[PDB]
Design a protein around this ligand. Structure first.
Ligand code: HEC
Length: 71
């Protein structure tokens, strides 16, 4: 699944078009902070203001992996 397309219609909603943060902190370099597993966990189990399972399955996995690349 197109990680970027998903992000563009699930994450950026709060994280801003650019992942720079907006209504949520910057996840642009989540991959530098946390591995795909951890990012995936957060996507699945949300965190603080973030509700969980925003994306799911290959949607979530692709995003997590792609963000693992983003630093
Ligand atoms: C608004 C309802 C959000 C959407 C849509 C997504 N996220 Fe989010 N995220 C949001 C907040 C407010 C926070 C901080 C939580 C708190 O209150 O403590 C986060 C956090 C993350 C993180 C961890 C960053 C950190 O706190 O160190 C990651 C890795 C993350 N979010 C990823 C992520 C992705 C990929 C999303 C689309 C599937 C996504 N978020 C949506 C708010 C919101």
């Amino acid at each position: 699944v197109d990680a970027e397309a998903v992000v563009q219609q699930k994450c950026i909603s709060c994280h801003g078009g650019d992942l720079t943060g907006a209504s949520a902190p910057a996840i642009d370099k989540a991959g530098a902070n946390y591995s795909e597993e951890e990012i995936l966990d957060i996507i699945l189990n949300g965190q603080g203001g973030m509700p969980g399972g925003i994306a799911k399955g290959a949607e979530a996995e692709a995003v997590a992996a792609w963000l693992a690349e983003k630093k």
